[PDB]
Design an enzyme around this catalytic site. Structure first.
Site, mmCIF file in Angstrom:
data_model
loop_
_atom_site.group_PDB
_atom_site.id
_atom_site.type_symbol
_atom_site.label_atom_id
_atom_site.label_comp_id
_atom_site.label_asym_id
_atom_site.label_seq_id
_atom_site.Cartn_x
_atom_site.Cartn_y
_atom_site.Cartn_z
ATOM 1 N N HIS A 33 0.769 -1.220 0.000
ATOM 2 C CA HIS A 33 0.000 0.000 0.000
ATOM 3 C C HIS A 33 0.818 1.298 0.000
ATOM 4 O O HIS A 33 0.235 2.353 -0.052
ATOM 5 C CB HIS A 33 -1.117 -0.002 1.055
ATOM 6 C CG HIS A 33 -0.682 0.283 2.467
ATOM 7 N ND1 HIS A 33 -0.327 1.547 2.911
ATOM 8 C CD2 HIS A 33 -0.648 -0.518 3.564
ATOM 9 C CE1 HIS A 33 -0.068 1.508 4.213
ATOM 10 N NE2 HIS A 33 -0.252 0.268 4.629
ATOM 11 N N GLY A 89 1.812 6.350 9.915
ATOM 12 C CA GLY A 89 3.235 6.403 9.531
ATOM 13 C C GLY A 89 3.957 5.177 10.092
ATOM 14 O O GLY A 89 5.140 4.951 9.804
ATOM 15 N N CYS A 100 3.230 2.006 9.548
ATOM 16 C CA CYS A 100 3.266 0.833 8.702
ATOM 17 C C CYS A 100 4.675 0.496 8.293
ATOM 18 O O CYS A 100 5.426 1.370 8.073
ATOM 19 C CB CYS A 100 2.397 1.046 7.490
ATOM 20 S SG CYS A 100 0.722 1.300 8.015
HETATM 21 C C1 LIG Z 1 0.430 2.838 8.682
HETATM 22 O O1 LIG Z 1 1.202 3.616 8.186
HETATM 23 C C2 LIG Z 1 -1.008 3.283 8.708
HETATM 24 C C3 LIG Z 1 -1.784 2.321 9.590
HETATM 25 C C4 LIG Z 1 -1.938 2.726 11.018
HETATM 26 C C5 LIG Z 1 -2.182 3.958 11.530
HETATM 27 N N1 LIG Z 1 -2.276 3.852 12.856
HETATM 28 C C6 LIG Z 1 -2.093 2.583 13.169
HETATM 29 N N2 LIG Z 1 -1.902 1.901 12.049
HETATM 30 N N3 LIG Z 1 -1.471 3.266 7.300
HETATM 31 C C7 LIG Z 1 -2.930 3.277 7.166
HETATM 32 C C8 LIG Z 1 -3.436 3.519 5.764
HETATM 33 C C9 LIG Z 1 -3.456 2.255 4.927
HETATM 34 C C10 LIG Z 1 -4.574 1.325 5.250
HETATM 35 C C11 LIG Z 1 -4.572 0.231 4.226
HETATM 36 C C12 LIG Z 1 -5.631 -0.777 4.570
HETATM 37 C C13 LIG Z 1 -6.998 -0.121 4.611
HETATM 38 C C14 LIG Z 1 -7.008 1.198 5.350
HETATM 39 C C15 LIG Z 1 -5.837 2.085 5.070
HETATM 40 C C16 LIG Z 1 -5.901 3.225 6.025
HETATM 41 N N4 LIG Z 1 -4.753 4.103 5.973
HETATM 42 C C17 LIG Z 1 -4.836 5.414 6.181
HETATM 43 O O2 LIG Z 1 -3.892 6.144 6.162
HETATM 44 C C18 LIG Z 1 -6.193 6.025 6.493
HETATM 45 C C19 LIG Z 1 -6.028 7.233 7.407
HETATM 46 N N5 LIG Z 1 -6.802 8.399 7.052
HETATM 47 C C20 LIG Z 1 -6.209 9.585 6.735
HETATM 48 C C21 LIG Z 1 -6.994 10.687 6.435
HETATM 49 C C22 LIG Z 1 -6.448 11.912 6.095
HETATM 50 C C23 LIG Z 1 -5.068 12.034 6.056
HETATM 51 C C24 LIG Z 1 -4.253 10.948 6.354
HETATM 52 C C25 LIG Z 1 -4.817 9.722 6.692
#
Ligand SMILES: *C(=O)[C@H](Cc1cnc[nH]1)NC[C@H]1C[C@@H]2CCCC[C@H]2CN1C(=O)CCNc1ccccc1
Length: 306
Positions: free
Chosen positions: A41, A143, A145
């Site tokens: 991703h 961040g 991941c």
């Molecule tokens: C890791 O970098 C993060 C996961 C995390 C955050 N806190 C704990 N774990 N990446 C999350 C990403 C990628 C996943 C992929 C699978 C499905 C959902 C998807 C969600 N992610 C997001 O970043 C959503 C967050 N929303 C957001 C909104 C506006 C600006 C930045 C992020």
């Protein structure tokens, strides 16, 4: 004496953490020899994620679509391939700090240490169990991941987890290092939830043994149980069923303490029925399940307190 959740020394893993950037997405990857592993991703934007097609996203990238930083050294990507939910990037430098390592797919109820990283930079370390529902109660921000889970045995790091995502309840999901999710989860924004979880019976009993190794016997009793009548009781209280193989696993701790595994099961059974009477075990008011039989043997004295 004492008994604490303890992680493995993080140094060997720290010297493997890098930063991986694709467009405006940034996360962590793991640099061993001339490869870097990271959540696939990283090629996605917030638009893509809910219904992405990774194959089709990926063919659209080149090697120079990926920016890999090791401290302040830029590493050049010279190859890339997808492997399940993981990208493998080939870089022009082999990591000089690569430790001896392997990859392992860990089983529910097992434990690992997590090196939480942001922007390639290790920030903290804690210990987690793989829940029965294939979640982990981690501590993770956006961040995080590409942060990994691991055990260390002599000189050798058994990598077993990389972080991808957080679920509605605040628990975390990820993959082994061949990119295969733990549990029924996918790296898409879909209405996926943690299934119901259970208490890990094997670890509770291991931790009861720990308490006896460090000198505490208050919760024992004179009774014994059949494996089967223990399970009738276990189910009521949302504990996993005890199997004969779990019984065998506790042999060495049974032997260090002279308490038969089924006698300890009667002890637990009584504890579940009656509570702890305002008392504590190894400093806890509650029954603990995030220490494995191996974790106990590793940390406790080989000589019992009495
Ligand atoms: C890791 O970098 C993060 C996961 C995390 C955050 N806190 C704990 N774990 N990446 C999350 C990403 C990628 C996943 C992929 C699978 C499905 C959902 C998807 C969600 N992610 C997001 O970043 C959503 C967050 N929303 C957001 C909104 C506006 C600006 C930045 C992020």
């Amino acid at each position: 004496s004492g008994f604490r959740k303890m992680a493995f020394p993080s140094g060997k893993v720290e010297g493997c953490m890098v930063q991986v950037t694709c467009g405006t997405t940034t996360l962590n990857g793991l640099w061993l020899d001339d490869t870097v592993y990271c959540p696939r991703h990283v090629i996605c934007t917030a638009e893509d994620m809910l219904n992405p097609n990774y194959e089709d996203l990926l063919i659209r990238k080149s090697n120079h679509s990926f920016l890999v930083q090791a401290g302040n050294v830029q590493l050049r990507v010279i190859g890339h391939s997808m492997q399940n939910c993981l990208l493998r990037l080939k870089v022009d430098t082999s990591n000089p700090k690569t430790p001896k390592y392997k990859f392992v797919r860990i089983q529910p109820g097992q434990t690992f240490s997590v090196l939480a990283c942001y922007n390639g930079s290790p920030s903290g370390v804690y210990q987690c169990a793989m829940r029965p529902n294939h979640t982990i109660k981690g501590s993770f921000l956006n961040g995080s991941c590409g942060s990994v889970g691991f055990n260390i045995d002599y000189d050798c790091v058994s990598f077993c987890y990389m972080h991808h995502m957080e679920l509605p309840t605040g628990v975390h999901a990820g993959t082994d290092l061949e990119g295969k999710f733990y549990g029924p989860f996918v790296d898409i924004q879909t209405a996926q939830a943690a299934g119901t979880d259970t208490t890990i019976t094997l670890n509770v009993l291991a931790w009861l043994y720990a308490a006896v190794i460090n000198g505490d016997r208050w919760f024992l009793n004179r009774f014994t149980t059949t494996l089967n009548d223990f399970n009738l009781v276990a189910m009521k209280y949302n504990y996993e069923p005890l199997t004969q193989d779990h019984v065998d696993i506790l042999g060495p701790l049974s032997a260090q303490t002279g308490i038969a595994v089924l006698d300890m099961c009667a002890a637990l059974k009584e504890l579940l029925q009656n509570g702890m009477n305002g008392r504590t075990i190894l400093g806890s008011t509650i029954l603990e399940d995030e220490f494995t039989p191996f974790d106990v043997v590793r940390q406790c004295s080989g000589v019992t307190f009495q």
